[PDB]
Design an enzyme around this catalytic site. Sequence first.
Site, mmCIF file in Angstrom:
data_model
loop_
_atom_site.group_PDB
_atom_site.id
_atom_site.type_symbol
_atom_site.label_atom_id
_atom_site.label_comp_id
_atom_site.label_asym_id
_atom_site.label_seq_id
_atom_site.Cartn_x
_atom_site.Cartn_y
_atom_site.Cartn_z
ATOM 1 N N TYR A 248 0.862 -1.350 0.164
ATOM 2 C CA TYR A 248 0.049 -0.072 -0.077
ATOM 3 C C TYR A 248 0.898 1.359 -0.091
ATOM 4 O O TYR A 248 0.841 2.020 -0.926
ATOM 5 C CB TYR A 248 -1.094 0.018 1.352
ATOM 6 C CG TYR A 248 -2.063 -0.952 1.127
ATOM 7 C CD1 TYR A 248 -2.706 -1.222 -0.241
ATOM 8 C CD2 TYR A 248 -2.537 -1.876 2.118
ATOM 9 C CE1 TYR A 248 -3.704 -2.087 -0.478
ATOM 10 C CE2 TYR A 248 -3.326 -2.850 1.873
ATOM 11 C CZ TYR A 248 -3.959 -3.048 0.539
ATOM 12 O OH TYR A 248 -4.967 -3.861 0.317
ATOM 13 N N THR A 249 1.782 1.284 0.972
ATOM 14 C CA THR A 249 2.623 2.487 1.016
ATOM 15 C C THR A 249 3.563 2.594 -0.196
ATOM 16 O O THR A 249 3.931 1.595 -0.418
ATOM 17 C CB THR A 249 3.257 2.551 2.256
ATOM 18 O OG1 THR A 249 4.378 1.613 2.328
ATOM 19 C CG2 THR A 249 2.257 2.532 3.425
#
Lengths: 49, 1068, 98, 99, 49
Positions: free
Chosen positions: D70-71
């Site tokens: 995600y990041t």
Amino acid sequence: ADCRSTDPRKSELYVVEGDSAGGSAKSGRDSMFQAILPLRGKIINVEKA
Amino acid sequence: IGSTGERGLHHLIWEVVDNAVDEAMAGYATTVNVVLLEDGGVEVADDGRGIPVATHASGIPTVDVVMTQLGVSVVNALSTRLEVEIKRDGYEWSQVYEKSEPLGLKQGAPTKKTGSTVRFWADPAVFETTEYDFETVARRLQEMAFLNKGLTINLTDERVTQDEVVDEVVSDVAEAPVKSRTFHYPGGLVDFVKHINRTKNAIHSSIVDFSGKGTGHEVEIAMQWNAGYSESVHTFANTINTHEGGTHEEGFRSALTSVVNKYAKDRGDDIREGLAAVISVKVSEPQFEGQTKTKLGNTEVKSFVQKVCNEQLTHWFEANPTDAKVVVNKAVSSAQARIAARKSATDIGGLPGKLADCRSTDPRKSELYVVEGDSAGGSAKSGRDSMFQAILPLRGKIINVEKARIDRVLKNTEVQAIITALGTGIHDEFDIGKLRYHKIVLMADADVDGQHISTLLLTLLFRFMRPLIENGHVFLAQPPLYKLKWQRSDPEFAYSDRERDGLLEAGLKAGKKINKEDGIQRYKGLGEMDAKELWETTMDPSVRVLRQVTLDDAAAADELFSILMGEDVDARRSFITRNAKDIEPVDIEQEMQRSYIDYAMSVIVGRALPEVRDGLKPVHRRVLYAMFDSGFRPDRSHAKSARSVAETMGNYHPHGDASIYDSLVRMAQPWSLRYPLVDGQGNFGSPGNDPPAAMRYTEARLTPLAMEMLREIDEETVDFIPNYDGRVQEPTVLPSRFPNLLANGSGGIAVGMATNIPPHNLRELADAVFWALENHDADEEETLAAVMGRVKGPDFPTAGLIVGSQGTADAYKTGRGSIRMRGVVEVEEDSRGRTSLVITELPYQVNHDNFITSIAEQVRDGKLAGISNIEDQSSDRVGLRIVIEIKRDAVAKVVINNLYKHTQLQTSFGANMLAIVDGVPRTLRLDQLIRYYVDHQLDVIVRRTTYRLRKANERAHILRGLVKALDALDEVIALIRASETVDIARAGLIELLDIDEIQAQAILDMQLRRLAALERQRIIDDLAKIEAEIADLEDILAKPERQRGIVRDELAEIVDRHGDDRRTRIIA
Amino acid sequence: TLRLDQLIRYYVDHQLDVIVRRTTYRLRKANERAHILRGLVKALDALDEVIALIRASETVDIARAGLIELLDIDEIQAQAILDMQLRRLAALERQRII
Amino acid sequence: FDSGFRPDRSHAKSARSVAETMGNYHPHGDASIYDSLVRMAQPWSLRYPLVDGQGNFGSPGNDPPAAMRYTEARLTPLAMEMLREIDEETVDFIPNYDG
Amino acid sequence: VEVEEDSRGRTSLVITELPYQVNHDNFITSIAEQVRDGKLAGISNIEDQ
Ligand SMILES: Nc1ncnc2c1ncn2[C@@H]1O[C@H](COP(=O)(O)OP(=O)(O)NP(=O)(O)O)[C@@H](O)[C@H]1O
Ligand SMILES: [Mg+2]
């Protein structure tokens, strides 16, 4: 993983760590006179113990 | 209508059906036929009276009058077309409405039979979707037949794909040698409570049923008390689910409590605790208040229902006292248990440091955001407007509240936390007045985790906190779907698929620059979005879009939650297998259904089931492809395991090395795979309790068999789809030029359903594939006969023995069978006459080090006798040697037999022929697995031939272009030298030679070394070389039977170089 | 275990080493790129003959050793010419090389 | 740096930066790597952050960062000065875990 | 620490900064426990805003 040989003269003990070469030392060995002791855990510091 | 989405779209069906059913409720219609049409319409047929056809008071026929006024008029308003077939007054009629325009009613044939039929097509220009949920429809019609004791409802779905599982009870076996459902419940509410207490498992056996004729009303109540932990008391006022309450509910409760107190004199939430009941009132002039259009007002109904319940309830206790006794021994149990529940120094109490509350004291202006800790914990806490927004990050696991007792529910920290935040209590202690935030914003990922959590919370709010949903305080964050990332401009956010193209075209047209591969960001997680982005797109009231969780039918929602969250595995399994090919007010029953299916399938495809085409789960497929694409082919030397793990982790499967390396290893282990896909180097463990060495130590590369798994993947032979970060393309399936599913087998359990396919012999499998290839046009019954016989059973790598052939023939003919396996024991005497049994072969999947210990501990506790020692003398040079020393008193034959009896030396393999066929879980027969593989192989060949033709007519174009320049070389070189820029030189080429911008660039980008005589002839010969290939692939496409052959020969070649002799011996 | 000055000086010293190591490499590379450009520029003057030569030899190795016979250069310089794309022989691009 | 995640270019998922380190430099469990990555991304951890993150990178409280899938993270204008001309033989190099 | 007030009349001390490496949530916790244990008196409430 004990060897066939009953006589300690001809016997041999290989002390490994399962994580390193346990599985493979177990395969490579001449099971006739070679035994494998794969260390499968954490050993203590027996110094001031 | 209520919603432009799915919620409002279904309301049309109810507005049609409700008229047809409340005609049956009048006692004139016997059967209602509901047909969901292939196109988009809905057909609601009936055997009622007929819609008034003759001319009304205005002057225009009554059919037209009812279709453009107050009701059903709205259906025609929101319809592109609405046809109305009426069979009344000795004749049948037409009356068609084109885009709400009443055209004309044509009187044809004279029908002496009564009824009606309405066919309406929804307008996609008005609604987001025109697709109706069968299950939603199905559930609401089922209760419609429960409420009316003598009516049949027949639901059929036309748009059912050629294959897809339609059945209610999805057969656990065989499945081989239009979605329809019928509702008729002669019991009425009695049949309904049987349906309710099916799983709840009732105490007493006598269903309480009584009907109360009113002075302007009519009530009917059915009851039963259960072992269960909650109240399933569904109320109805004129076929309408009064979930909010109303006078009929509060009148029955008064009269019920004032009845249980009279029988307490013999020997509230307290009483009701068990009960599953159905109140069905009929009111002449019913007027409902509430926050929802529900909750019956009518004050005389309270006094009527209380009078009916008083007399009729006491009567049941008097007539059936033996069941009445076991009723009170549940009610008084409920009292003292929740009494004991009731019952600190200078305490804040207000959630220590597990929450970040808002400044605002007033709940009216206050908002609570329930996020997942690792999802939006930090970003929500920071992005927010603290003045009125609170953030409760769930740092832990949420219980499946559905079947659990209020004891374990309130114990669970993450549940306990929620209640503490809102301020309101639980079931009895619950007081909506105490509500501390007038909006509960549940924010969670689109990822398999986020969907799993939504289901869990929507289960909780529906059960332990129903008022919060009804009053409209429960919401769902609507975060951006896409991030259109421009190169010079700031990114634009799209919430819809349609909205993306909007901003994409307009933005490009206005003069913007985006990447045409990775330029768009489809969000999966809230963890992706920056703090600033999170406020600007999904948190700020001035821009955000929220989703109001509304309950639209509590009795149908009771069903949905009792299936997906309940304890019935076979009902849940079936639902998943049926539904497998899958500000704003949102329905709970539809969010709960979508979130469940999406999670259910992700955990099924991901870890439980192999594909039928290539036999792999995604992890293995992603290891193999990253390895292939990284070039770790068998020709090239091994690469450190870490390299392959890293390549899978970074590009295809971005979850911790843990599982990635764990699969890499299995594909390398010759005791794990019959046909290993990975060629390892170093310690890859043992079939005992020895692990492999670190990924940093071991080395692996593909095996030439795994090269056949990948063979020509780069030639567009499979459908690729974008990877997690939509940067690359990952294959949906591998070509599989040898039948991997059957060759290697497959295991796996996840979300109720499990697979267990055994490994087989490639040689025997090729025989059956060649039969299927050749006998392409033959019956399921004949082809199944032929595959068995060619295929003589499973062929485990660990070898051993297969005792008998029933369970083998069972699993081939059905898809479920038990295969007995036995190990090979040899007998060798010592020198001192000391005999000793030596295990040489053990059955597949039996752990070696776990086996020796079993015997040791069995001997230790006396269960095993005549054994004096166990030694592992096994090595690579002498195979398996588990040496059991037998006593001189003990008979070696009986010991061998007792080991076959108790220990793992004999164990039966339970086969389950489950595989993902067209995205649908399916139990298969040996022939189906064969014919689906041949299917794949024949596709692969034409696709390969297609790309090859394209990628040659592409090259030839260039080569023809280059050859043209070689003969015109003097001109070509004197031209380039005279021209000042490259683009001026390129323009001059298209002039000089009638060539393309691509043929000319081939000339320009051409190196000087390519001009030496031999290399010119290399280009001259290459053109006539490629032109010969083109001629061939044109023929390959043209001849399908030629492609059938290619498959045969390409596969024979694979078994001619990699096939091997049968490892395990089948015995009887 | 260090004082503040020990840390500052050990830093400064490494920066002073970073500069020399760079300048040395930059120079080492600047003479590498120069001899190549010297090779190509020499080839731009004989261009007519250079082109005439390459096509008059069957293999690239006859052309390579012929590119040292013609222009008095080295194998690395002669490989720079052979790998020269035809595009690099348009007026502006020839001027980029000189 | 080697993977070309300069601050000029757009953000790359953390998993790509993690997979590369684990791939040919530090072949251990992704947690140890990503945890280091995350530290250099946190402005309350580094006085002068070396990683330009995007997404939930935890908090100075008991909030963890999001998953590496995600990041997104890339190098910083300052971290570029940390790697300024590494390609120019300004430092010594040694052969990696596999060599 | 800043000391805001005159809302309802009730005063409060707002922590605007904390020393390097103190865990915010484990600090709020620390205070709250001390308060529960009586060890820290005068504090009527704590919250992260
Ligand atoms: N199968 C039928 N046979 C005869 N009349 C019918 C049939 N179906 C519907 N109607 C009539 O069609 C009229 C128009 O429908 P509608 O506008 O919905 O009124 P309503 O049924 O009284 N109210 P509502 O509760 O909103 O459905 C009804 O009032 C009925 O009289
Ligand atoms: Mg109606």
